[PDB]
Amino acid sequence: TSAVQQKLAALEKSSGGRLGVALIDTADNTQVLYRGDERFPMCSTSKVMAAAAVLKQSETQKQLLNQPVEIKPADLVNYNPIAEKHVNGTMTLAELSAAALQYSDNTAMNKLIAQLGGPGGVTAFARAIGDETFRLDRTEPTLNTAIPGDPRDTTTPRAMAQTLRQLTLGHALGETQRAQLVTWLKGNTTGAASIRAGLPTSWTVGNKTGSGDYGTTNDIAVIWPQGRAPLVLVTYFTQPQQNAESRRDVLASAARIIAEGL
Incomplete structure (x- = not known):
């Protein structure tokens, strides 16, 4: 096991939880993995999969993203920073996608799942782009229970890393759709203390974080350093206690170790 893996393992040991990491360096298409085939609760990182599926x-449906969508009181769930600004109005599928990706709005996520025909429609898109591991079983907010051993609403770091590559750098999507996804991811406003805090300041990042129960703290990102090929980095972390506190620092520190490993 390499140098990077010894440090990730020590990071993990110091944290008292369970850490999962997958990097894809699209130079020699090299990978760095830590528990990369273990399942982790995705929490709000699953919003990328739902937004990508509506994009597809x-x-x-060339005018689908402009379709207005009713926001009714009953549609509000536990955390709706944007949608609560439009109760008894509308939002378009573009505005809903942006809200889900940029402000982690759970009502926006639920509208994307409905557009796709239920959680099975998000899973179907994953299967249709080669990802046999991703599975979305529930809507917001119950997909965040992150119960240890529960396979519902999980993926693996290896799987999500490859998937995120295809979506943001490959051609799983039409170019137009891929560019809109990249824009959305770069304009995220909620994942600054995670991967973003462990990387060189000058690298460009589009990402999506996720938290839930059991101190689940996640981040998935596409990174553009200067002078070299882009990379994809996934960092999942979960803890033994249901009431555990968030640990974004562990994700930043894993990102630091990975980048120090380039």
């Missing part, structure tokens, strides 16, 4: 729909 819009390829043949």
Whole structure:
């Protein structure tokens, strides 16, 4: 096991929880993995999968992203920073996607899942782009229970890293759709203390964080350093106690160790 793995293991040991990491360096398409085939609760990182799936729909429904969508009181769940600004109005599928990705709005996520026909529709998109591991079983907010051993609403670091590559750098999506996803990810406003805090300041990052129960603290990101090929980094972390506190620092520190390993 390499140098980077010894440090990740020590990081993990100092944390008292369970850490999962997967990097894809698209130079020699090299990978660095730590518990990369273990399942982790995705929490709000799953919003990328749902937004990407609506994007893929819009390829043949050219005006789908402009379709207005009613926001009714009953649609509000536990955390709706944007949607609560439009109760008894509308938001378009573009505004809903942006809200889900940029402000982690759970009502926005639920509208994307409904557009796709339920959680099974998000899983179907994953299968349709090669990802046999991702599974979305519940809507917001119950997908965040992150119960140890519960396979619901999980993926693996290896799987999500490859998937995120295909979506943001490959051609799982039409170019137009891919560019809109990148824009959305770069304009995220909620994942600054995680991966973003362990990387060189000058690298560009688009990412999506996720928290839930059991101190689950996650981040998935596509990174553009200067002078070299882009990379994909996934960092998942979860803890033994249901009421555990968030540990974004562990994700930043894993990102630091990975980048120090380039």
